[PDB]
Design a protein around this ligand. Sequence first.
Ligand SMILES: NC(=O)C1=CN([C@@H]2O[C@H](COP(=O)(O)OP(=O)(O)OC[C@H]3O[C@@H](n4cnc5c(N)ncnc54)[C@H](OP(=O)(O)O)[C@@H]3O)[C@@H](O)[C@H]2O)C=CC1
Ligand SMILES: CCC(CC)n1ccc2c3c(N)nc(N)nc3ccc21
Length: 192
Amino acid sequence: MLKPNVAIIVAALKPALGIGYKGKMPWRLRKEIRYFKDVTTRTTKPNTRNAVIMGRKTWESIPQKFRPLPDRLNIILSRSYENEIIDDNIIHASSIESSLNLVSDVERVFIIGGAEIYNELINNSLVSHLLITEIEHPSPESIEMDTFLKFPLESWTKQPKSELQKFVGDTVLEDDIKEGDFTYNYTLWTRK
Ligand SMILES: NC(=O)C1=CN([C@@H]2O[C@H](COP(=O)(O)OP(=O)(O)OC[C@H]3O[C@@H](n4cnc5c(N)ncnc54)[C@H](OP(=O)(O)O)[C@@H]3O)[C@@H](O)[C@H]2O)C=CC1
Ligand SMILES: CCC(CC)n1ccc2c3c(N)nc(N)nc3ccc21
């Protein structure tokens, strides 16, 4: 696949944009994990699937029994990997672009984490869209976080919900979702 548009999908706690703590997510938001699954799996074209790209640490964090993530082509990046097709669902690569050369019959490509991947790939021009779940809490300072996004948001524009709706198609987008003390909303950003 030559020069696909790539989207970053992430959930972050405002205002610092914290995303993890000691290798894990700092929260358990049930509806948010379901949205992630629906967005990353759904396709419009016929015999296609989406691709999800992740760093090695993120892959290793999913229990072995639950990987690869079903119904999507999984791509795992490591600086130590040769570009190799493991099976029909798993690819090893050392660069985003080399990995895409190995794929076909993919509709959309999503970068799914983690921190290092996000922070480096945000500056790659292949990245055209950001799907950020913006989480709010009454006392964000009480949530222990060690990992944060370093995104240059002054160069991106947050779109109206109508554009997000168009991006996700059929997916139901509820507003101000509350789970425990967290309140969240889904958003779409594009480059200025
Ligand atoms: N809030 C959210 O939506 C999400 C949060 N996370 C959180 O992220 C954290 C994990 O992030 P982190 O520890 O940074 O790990 P990553 O998942 O980003 O993996 C880092 C590894 O990826 C490889 N890698 C990184 N950058 C590159 C590159 N540019 N080219 C090739 N290989 C690369 C390296 O593998 P090697 O060392 O083998 O070279 C590196 O060690 C956890 O807290 C996790 O819960 C994860 C996903 C979503
Ligand atoms: C499904 C496996 C887990 C492991 C951390 N996971 C990995 C990536 C994501 C993930 C992501 N990238 N974006 C958003 N919005 N939500 C997520 C929820 C869970 C995630």
